[PDB]
Write a protein that binds this ligand. Structure first.
Ligand SMILES: NCCCCNC(=O)c1ccc(S(N)(=O)=O)cc1
Ligand SMILES: [Hg+2]
Ligand SMILES: [Zn+2]
Length: 257
């Protein structure tokens, strides 16, 4: 099974998932001086007021907070998006050290972690159908830097103990995702893909310019999770990120200048 170890990491993925060497793979390095400011880009419209979190689960490679996507409860629209995208789940990618962890980089700079808010285009009926379309998903990427503690992240941090190993889950209702958003919504956008296998190229990436701050203690608890299942030898869940991929025939557009 794919992973992040020396023997099953990103460099091995192409063998089981040929698309790893595709034309629009993610993440990518964002060159701020080459990004094109596009005045036609509309502002982002994030409507998370009716968000309904359900559960938090350790899936062996990260922990996902799942949301009820049966109706337009938490949606994303505007920006470079055409149509409404529903929030289905959010996860993080982090490193073993504060100087690494993010998947996307800015001018080669790596952040301590990266939050991914995954959304699927509603015109496609369900997530399964969305992952078969070039415009099926929209992931909102947010960088995390170590500094002051993020209050809205604490409830997520406190529940990590119960989902220490792969396969474990815990009820996680009434969590407001808006507490994880930065002040500004300025972003960079480009067509890409999932950063983990199957690496499907169905994503319109929206990476926010402004990072959020989290405390050393908060990030530390992320590192206490396990890749392994209960009863198996312990493997600390750290460095679950993929290196930058070639931009190729793509242009990153900025909503700001
Ligand atoms: N068949 C589709 C795959 C099912 C499970 N994987 C996902 O849904 C998924 C979603 C977002 C990212 S990421 N990291 O790019 O936000 C990575 C993976
Ligand atoms: Hg696709
Ligand atoms: Zn991700």
């Amino acid at each position: 099974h794919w992973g992040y170890g020396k023997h099953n990491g990103p460099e091995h993925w192409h063998k089981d998932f040929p698309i790893a060497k595709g034309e629009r793979q993610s993440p990518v390095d964002i060159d701020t001086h080459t990004a094109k400011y596009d005045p036609s880009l509309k502002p982002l419209s994030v409507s998370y007021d009716q968000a309904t979190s359900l559960r938090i689960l350790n899936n062996g490679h990260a922990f996902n907070v799942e949301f009820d996507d049966s109706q337009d409860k938490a949606v994303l629209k505007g920006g470079p998006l055409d149509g409404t995208y529903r929030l289905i789940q959010f996860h993080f990618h982090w490193g073993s050290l504060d100087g690494q962890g993010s998947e996307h980089t800015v001018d080669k700079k790596k952040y301590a972690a990266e939050l991914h808010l995954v959304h699927w285009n509603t015109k496609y009926g369900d997530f399964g159908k969305a992952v078969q379309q070039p415009d099926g998903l929209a992931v909102l990427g947010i960088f995390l830097k170590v500094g002051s503690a993020k209050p809205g992240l604490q409830k997520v941090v406190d529940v990590l103990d119960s989902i220490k190993t792969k396969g474990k889950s815990a009820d996680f209702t009434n969590f407001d995702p808006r507490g994880l958003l930065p002040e500004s919504l300025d972003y960079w956008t480009y067509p890409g893909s999932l950063t983990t296998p199957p690496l499907l190229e169905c994503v319109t990436w929206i990476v926010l310019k402004e990072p959020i701050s989290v405390s050393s203690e908060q990030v530390l608890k992320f590192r206490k999770l396990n890749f392994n299942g209960e009863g198996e030898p312990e493997e600390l869940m750290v460095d679950n990120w993929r290196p930058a991929q070639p931009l190729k025939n793509r242009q990153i557009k900025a909503s700001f200048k």
